[PDB]
Ligand binder design. Structure first.
Ligand SMILES: Cc1[nH]nc2c1[C@]1(C(C#N)=C(N)O2)c2cc(-c3ccncc3)cc(F)c2CC1(C)C
Ligand SMILES: Cc1[nH]nc2c1[C@]1(C(C#N)=C(N)O2)c2cc(-c3ccncc3)cc(F)c2CC1(C)C
Ligand SMILES: Cc1ncc(COP(=O)(O)O)c(CNCC(=O)O)c1O
Ligand SMILES: Cc1ncc(COP(=O)(O)O)c(CNCC(=O)O)c1O
Ligand SMILES: [Cl-]
Lengths: 442, 442
């Protein structure tokens, strides 16, 4: 007593939008630093009948029975995540139930410090996440500012983590956790120097490596596992898995953190886990360990180097003047256009990128840059040589944006009027569509 | 630069466990009141490349572009949700982003009350959810007891919401929210008397209808939309959709609540939404507004009344002595076997059900009943006539449980020792497997 007709026939209205969405992804230069494209196997897991099953609790300690095949999957996902990040299951544990990045961070923070607890992280404007304590004078925007007591450290005028600022704040504020690892930070991190500050004031070290996860697993970038008490990561960005998250905790440095963190996820915050997610992560964690995937991650860095280098070659300014990872932030101040304008322009040509703040910006409205990343396009087969084109396309857009701002004026309402019925954008969109459209597409 | 090999090729190890899970679901009389089986369409959505897209924010007010086909899907799902629950889009708004029920409720509670905010809900033992303020003497087990100030109201010695206790407790506590709608409550709810109590003390009324959602949509049970400020529901139980949740808010009653609830889901708590969930929820909400689904929901009730009747005809006691909905709680005190033991036994014979406290129980260690529900088996095409069989199988199991407790004793460690190899269980399992194995399976 159900309907087994295929999606096409049962809901034709929806199937059309999805086939459109499918086409727009195929036909887009995707420089969203946090996006990727999942393979069929990860998606077959996501659509598996395992999500039918309620499995509250943990493996071998479920409230309900019938969880024997579920337990094998959750155990196989946990092991593979400790294997993938080069940690012994004797020293490190992993929770695989957070439904996404923001949940895992709120969860892990609560575990360490509890309500009214004291935390530090990078300000949103300098490159931190909302879940790293973000507030404004008007309102506590994130639960991490309101259910904890948060204070925020900035990057210097050049865009680097300023450790002398972290120490000045840690000793006066005396927090219980300091968060590093970021959302738009183009360089590697000094986890050791962070440990020195945290050891000084009896604070926990929290590394959110969601943007750089693969770099950490593949030993290309610095390993926070040698220093951090807690490591969180999403599974959907550079790691190229489903939308989910992992919480890592160091047992040796902190006895009884295992209990604190597992009970924070359930039953403190979540109910039933989503087993199709857990299955899908297991599927990608296998691939994350293979030598094929090390090559891809190397390739993500080689594309990001090439891209920053080519953008500098066309006299485009980059925050910190370059990158140690998959991401770049462009300082657009010399062209007197906002980051929002270039986004609008880039969307008109099937270029996905996003607006992003720079050190000179005081407010989050009217951000002066854009963030770009290489994992998505790297996933679609682009090589070092294709980065010149992406650079040419973005230069062309910066220029088109300058022309249109002078014609229609400097107000976002007026600017957009310019975008439709501009012959250069249609010209540029087409070029984008032909090159992108034919790239390998999982 | 990806691996496109099919799941069975890429990860044979995982693919086996999944095919086993599938076999066990096919061969199980599933009486878990909160489970169901999703059709292939809802599973194709969950496996759609729409999950690739980052779309932080709400429709027409997104942080990144590229979100025109995502906006269409998030707009389709909200409308289809409001139609299905018989509410005007002028009077009611819905948020479709919550990742699961427990998230929806933490998010919605925060919107109304904020941190340190005062709440009331039904105790866990008496049939309410963890997210309705559950704590113990030992610990604040839910975040809803810790980030909020919660008080809990019991059912009477017969299993019924005791309104006169709700008033006594509301008037001396003075909460800002009172929560009704429940996890294991076998009867309909008097939303009007809750509304009257809520008005009297100026509190909000919060109805969580996750277990009864379909009965409300189809006008079979009382409508909490006529009385509540907020209604939450999961989409994966009786509604037969994916793992997700909806938050409903009444604008007419509470001006400026739309912003409060939307800003609570993002950016207070969540980041990017899971678009494959959103798509999948749309696909099910089409189905929920069809009379084929009224036919099914009616059938879930007809089965549940019939099952209760057949259980009583075998002198098995039920809490409240029957059911108004999809769920029964068996009071196992007369057989002097616990719920834990019957669960253990029922797993041994491929009957999935769960242990459940009863009004006479003081504490949740050794609960004296089990909960059963009809949605899953109704979905596999069972009818009224088949409930005598389920009843008869549950009776046979209760009896085997008494025998094994006589022989091996009343300690759970010693009890289970009896289960493996028992000739009658093997007998009973074969019968379960042959009947279940045969039933239509989406
Ligand atoms: C939404 C979100 N989530 N975690 C984030 C963001 C970012 C952001 C940046 N910069 C950082 N670092 O991380 C962001 C935030 C705000 C914002 C401004 C004011 N109030 C709330 C949000 C505006 C933005 F353009 C962005 C770009 C972003 C998505 C990468
Ligand atoms: C896990 C969970 N989540 N929301 C729930 C439960 C239940 C439960 C019942 N009764 C109710 N009413 O709703 C439950 C909870 C606890 C429990 C006791 C102490 N500490 C944590 C959990 C033990 C149980 F056997 C159950 C049965 C259940 C799953 C239906
Ligand atoms: C460092 C960091 N942490 C957590 C998250 C949260 O993930 P969820 O969206 O899955 O909650 C993000 C995503 N940030 C958005 C972006 O950079 O594009 C992030 O950049
Ligand atoms: C009333 C109620 N509310 C919220 C939830 C939370 O759903 P998530 O598991 O998606 O967080 C449940 C499920 N409780 C499990 C059961 O009764 O079987 C529930 O019964
Ligand atoms: Cl999902």
């Amino acid at each position: 007593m159900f309907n087994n007709e295929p999606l096409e026939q049962i809901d034709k209205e929806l199937h059309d939008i999805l086939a459109d969405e499918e086409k727009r992804q195929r036909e887009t230069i995707n420089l969203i630093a946090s996006e990727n494209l999942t393979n069929g196997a990860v998606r077959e897991c996501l659509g598996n009948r395992v999500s039918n099953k309620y499995s509250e609790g943990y493996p071998k300690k479920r409230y309900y029975g019938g969880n024997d095949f579920i337990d094998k999957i959750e155990e196989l996902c946990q092991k593979r995540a400790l294997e993938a990040f080069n940690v012994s299951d004797e020293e490190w544990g992993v929770n695989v139930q957070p439904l996404s990045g923001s949940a895992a961070n709120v969860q892990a923070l609560y575990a360490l410090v509890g309500v009214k607890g004291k935390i530090m992280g990078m300000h949103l404007c300098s490159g931190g996440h909302l879940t790293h304590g973000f507030f404004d004078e008007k309102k506590k925007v994130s639960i991490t500012s309101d259910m904890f007591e948060s204070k925020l450290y900035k990057c210097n005028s050049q865009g680097y983590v300023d450790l002398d600022a972290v120490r000045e704040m840690a000793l006066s504020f005396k927090p219980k956790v300091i968060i590093c690892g970021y959302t738009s930070y183009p360089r590697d991190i000094d986890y050791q120097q962070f440990r020195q500050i945290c050891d000084e004031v009896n604070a926990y070290l929290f590394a959110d490596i969601s943007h750089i996860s693969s770099f950490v697993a593949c030993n290309i970038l610095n390993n926070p596992f040698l220093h951090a008490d807690v490591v969180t990561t999403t599974t959907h960005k550079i790691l190229r898995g489903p939308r989910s998250a992992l919480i890592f905790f160091n047992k040796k440095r902190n006895p009884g953190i295992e209990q604190k963190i597992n009970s924070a996820v359930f039953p403190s915050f979540q109910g039933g886990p989503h087993n199709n997610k857990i299955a899908a992560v297991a599927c990608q964690l296998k691939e994350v360990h293979s030598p094929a995937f090390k090559e891809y991650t190397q390739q993500v860095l080689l594309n990001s180097k090439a891209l920053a280098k080519a953008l500098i070659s066309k006299q485009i300014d980059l925050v910190t003047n370059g990158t140690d990872n998959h991401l770049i932030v462009v300082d657009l101040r010399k062209f007197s256009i906002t980051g929002s304008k270039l986004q609008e322009t880039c969307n008109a040509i099937n270029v996905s990128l996003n607006k992003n703040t720079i050190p000179s910006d005081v407010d989050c409205v009217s951000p002066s840059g854009v963030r770009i990343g290489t994992p998505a396009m790297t996933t679609r087969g682009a090589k070092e040589k294709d980065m010149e084109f992406i650079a040419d396309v973005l230069a062309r857009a910066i220029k088109i944006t300058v022309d249109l701002q002078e014609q229609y004026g400097k107000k976002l309402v007026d600017f957009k009027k310019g975008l439709p019925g501009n012959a250069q954008l249609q010209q540029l969109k087409q070029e984008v569509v032909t090159w992108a459209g034919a790239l390998p597409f999982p």
